[PDB]
Design a protein around this ligand. Sequence first.
Ligand SMILES: [Cl-]
Ligand SMILES: [Zn+2]
Ligand SMILES: [Zn+2]
Ligand SMILES: [Zn+2]
Length: 122
Amino acid sequence: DDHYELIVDGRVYYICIVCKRSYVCLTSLRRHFNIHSWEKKYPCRYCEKVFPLAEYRTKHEIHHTGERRYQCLACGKSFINYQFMSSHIKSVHSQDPSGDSKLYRLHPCRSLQIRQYAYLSD
DNA sequence: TGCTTCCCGCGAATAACG
DNA sequence: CGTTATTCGCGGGAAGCA
Ligand SMILES: [Cl-]
Ligand SMILES: [Zn+2]
Ligand SMILES: [Zn+2]
Ligand SMILES: [Zn+2]
């Protein structure tokens, strides 16, 4: 295909034939390989930019709307992504949101049309 | 060296198939 | 049309960048 398989200790890795990156999941290799082949394009709906992964485009479009989905539950401040939220909580509140810490709320995305995870609304 | 974007295992949502 | 196949949102560490 666009990969070969490597097997060590009875565990299978899928290896990208172009850059030789390894993947535990074949769907991950397929997702990655678009970067090489560009057989699918994900163009921004607000500007001319085009991305090789759907999620890169989504994260990018959020910047166009200015929606702040990530909210610190200690002081209420909201942030556009996980990284700014995490940086805030570690720096201002001296706490780590990783694991399940319940230190932040991820609101559903309302400023554009993306797939909605049920767990975000209740 | 602090933003900024990328990366990939995981699995819920949904499209494609029957 | 219920069943499987596919897509891609999410965490949170890594890498890129000026
Ligand atoms: Cl908002
Ligand atoms: Zn590759
Ligand atoms: Zn854009
Ligand atoms: Zn806060």
